[PDB]
Design a protein. Structure first.
Lengths: 41, 46, 49, 148, 42, 116, 147, 102
């Protein structure tokens, strides 16, 4: 169905991955939470 | 020194062009202009 | 890792076959000087075209 | 902040034009005949052998038992045909080698006397190169000289 | 990497040199060949 | 550099000084073919490089995934969308300055200011 | 497939930096010594110098590569003929089959199979290797050129 | 004793995809001025695409040291390859990418 793509090392040189989807994909708190990077990309 | 283009040239008294290549090498390579051999980055320090 | 496997590989024939029928000019006929920006196409370290 | 599993309870609950005809050429002539394709590297615009030179002469230039290695016939046949093809005058000269890259999928449209055509498969192609034109050769004369 | 092996590589290794031939000269010559088949696994 | 090749031999046209005319020729060391000297230069070394630092620039350059972004105008188009990258001379001591490319007209423009 | 070859063409870059004699030889198997590269282009039928630089420098505009190429070309200027070139190599490896009519066959024979056993091992594709090689050179310069 | 039959017989070599070449081991060229087309013999209708306008240093010869009976047929007049009716050709092409073995 073309949902997820198997990926290897050589291939990774060419792509730009996201840590967590909800984290990052939608363009847009506890003090005890670890500080997390932005979705500029 | 008054010149903005620091340019220096020379000529000599088969094909001379090749010795020049040998000749211009040594010039660049082995002619120190000052300072002792093997010594670079005279680094100050207090 | 947990989520890793290994390519057990295959034949590359059908692949080559495709590009053949798909504009990958044969190498032999490559004339760079006039086609400056051809993208080289490699397979398994074999620069086919 | 916990591990919850029975959501199977949830999930099972939550659930102009000009015609030009063709003809596959008769086969007997092909059966008797071998034809192939010339290619030159002269970088000359056409290099017509007409304007090349005359004449033209193109041609190739009891014990016990034992083990023989195995090869398919066409390879043995073509390997055997290692004598490079050479056309001459008796003045310039041309020789080539086989290419094996583009002899498969190749049929030619002979522009016959008619606007029609015939289609002819390709047997071989060759790449004749001019040679000896400035005629310098030092077979071992520069070789032994080389080591200098 | 084993299912791959048993299925295919085993055979392709056979098919490479199924054949090897011995030719006896006479006084018309002989020529003995022997060749393998597809591989069967129990 | 920028040296011709023979005709009917297509081999590199070496310098041959004419002593008579007091000038330089250029021959096919394979054949007879020769030709005069059109630029009084012969050779050069050119130790330093600021050449090529725009390699890979194509009118297909934006299509790259991972060049990050900014907004500066085309210094010609005034077109404020564009993409950047660093000096293609992936040499050691090279400076950092950023090469930008308009996405309207692919207008090259870097980001350093000291010399355009 | 086929005897699982381990054949390592290496393409050495003679010459420490700055120095001239920046020559390039290559170490084809069963060959006693390292062979100058132009002798190999020739060996695969690319006689003329202009055609050669097509195989390696992929730009009519970068000349620096050509500059480091310069010495490597006259390296070949000795030879001008494929057969001489091929004969040269015949003179270069495991000379047992004295017949030059059989020996230059052999340097042919070897360079059919025993060199880049990949892209082929059969007659005719000789030019295609002459690119792939002609490419490997490019990167060697390209690297040593620090780009 | 090489012979030159014509060395000028204008000929258009073509490269083909596998199926038609295999089917070729006639038709009608409907040149359209230059959207050249061909009406094949029944089967599909494959036009003419101009792979190379002008073709040189390339000629057709024949065969029957040892010389052999060799004649010069003619010069390649113009190179073409083929545009292959279409969806079925497209379907079989993608279908061709689905081989198998024992
Ligand atoms: Zn010349
Ligand atoms: Zn702009």
């Amino acid at each position: 169905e073309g949902l997820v793509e198997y990926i290897d090392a050589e291939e990774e040189e060419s792509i730009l991955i996201a840590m967590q989807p909800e984290d990052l994909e939608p363009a847009e708190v506890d003090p005890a939470k670890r500080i997390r990077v932005s979705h500029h990309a | 020194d008054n010149d903005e283009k620091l340019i220096i040239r020379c000529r000599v008294v088969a094909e001379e062009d090749h010795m020049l290549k040998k000749i211009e090498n040594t010039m660049l390579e082995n002619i120190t202009l000052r300072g002792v051999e093997n010594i670079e980055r005279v680094v100050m320090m207090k | 890792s947990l989520m890793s496997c290994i390519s057990v590989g295959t034949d590359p024939m059908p692949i080559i076959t495709f590009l053949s029928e798909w504009g990958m000019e044969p190498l032999e006929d490559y004339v760079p000087h006039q086609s400056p920006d051809a993208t080289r196409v490699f397979v398994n370290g074999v620069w086919h075209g | 902040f916990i591990k919850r599993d029975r959501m199977r309870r949830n999930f099972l609950r939550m659930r102009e034009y000009n015609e030009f005809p063709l003809r596959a050429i008769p086969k007997e002539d092909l059966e008797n005949m071998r034809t192939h394709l010339l290619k030159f590297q002269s970088k000359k615009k056409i290099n017509p052998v007409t304007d090349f030179h005359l004449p033209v002469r193109l041609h190739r230039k009891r014990k016990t038992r034992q083990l023989k290695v195995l090869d398919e016939n066409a390879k043995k046949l073509r390997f055997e045909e290692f004598y490079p093809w050479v056309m001459e005058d008796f003045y310039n000269t041309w020789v080539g080698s086989y290419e094996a890259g583009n002899s498969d999928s190749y049929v030619l449209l002979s522009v016959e006397d008619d606007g029609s055509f015939t289609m002819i498969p390709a047997d071989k192609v060759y790449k004749f190169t001019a040679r000896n034109k400035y005629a310098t050769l030092t077979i071992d004369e520069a070789e032994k000289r080389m080591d200098k | 990497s084993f299912n791959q092996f048993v299925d295919y590589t085993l055979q392709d290794i056979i098919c490479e040199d199924s054949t090897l031939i011995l030719e006896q000269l006479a006084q018309i010559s002989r020529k003995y060949e022997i060749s393998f088949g597809k591989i069967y696994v129990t | 550099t920028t040296f011709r090749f023979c005709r009917d031999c297509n081999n590199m046209l070496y310098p041959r000084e004419d002593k008579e005319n007091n000038r330089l020729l250029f021959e096919c060391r394979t054949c007879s073919y020769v030709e005069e000297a059109g630029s009084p230069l012969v050779y050069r070394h050119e130790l330093i490089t600021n050449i090529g630092e725009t390699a890979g620039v194509v009118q297909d350059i934006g299509s790259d995934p991972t060049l990050p972004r900014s907004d500066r105008e085309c210094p010609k188009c005034h077109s404020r969308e564009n993409v950047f990258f660093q000096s293609q001379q992936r040499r050691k001591d090279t400076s950092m300055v950023l090469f930008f490319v308009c996405l309207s007209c692919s207008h090259i423009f870097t980001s350093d200011q000291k010399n355009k | 497939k086929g005897s699982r070859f381990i054949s390592t063409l290496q393409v050495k870059l003679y010459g420490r930096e700055g120095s001239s004699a920046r020559t390039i030889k290559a170490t084809l198997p069963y060959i006693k010594q390292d062979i100058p590269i132009v002798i190999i282009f020739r060996a695969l039928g690319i006689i003329p110098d202009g055609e050669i630089l097509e195989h390696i420098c992929y730009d009519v505009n970068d000349w620096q590569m050509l500059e480091m190429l310069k010495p490597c070309v006259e390296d070949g200027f000795v030879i001008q003929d494929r057969e001489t070139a091929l004969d040269f190599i015949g003179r270069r490896g495991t000379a047992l089959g004295i017949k030059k009519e059989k020996r230059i066959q052999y340097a042919k024979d070897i360079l059919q199979k025993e060199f880049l056993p990949h892209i082929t091992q059969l007659e005719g594709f000789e030019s295609r290797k002459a690119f792939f090689l002609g490419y490997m050179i490019n990167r060697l310069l390209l690297c040593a050129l620090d780009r | 004793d090489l012979d030159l039959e014509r060395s000028n017989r204008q000929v258009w070599l073509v490269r083909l995809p596998m199926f038609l070449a295999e089917k070729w081991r006639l038709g009608k060229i409907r040149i359209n001025k230059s959207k050249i087309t061909l009406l094949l013999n029944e089967p599909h209708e494959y036009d003419l695409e101009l792979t190379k306008k002008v073709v040189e240093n390339e000629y057709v010869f024949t065969e029957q040291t040892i010389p052999k009976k060799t004649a010069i047929v003619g010069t390649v007049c113009h190179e073409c390859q083929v545009m292959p009716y279409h969806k079925i050709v497209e379907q079989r092409r993608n279908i061709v990418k689905l081989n198998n073995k024992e």
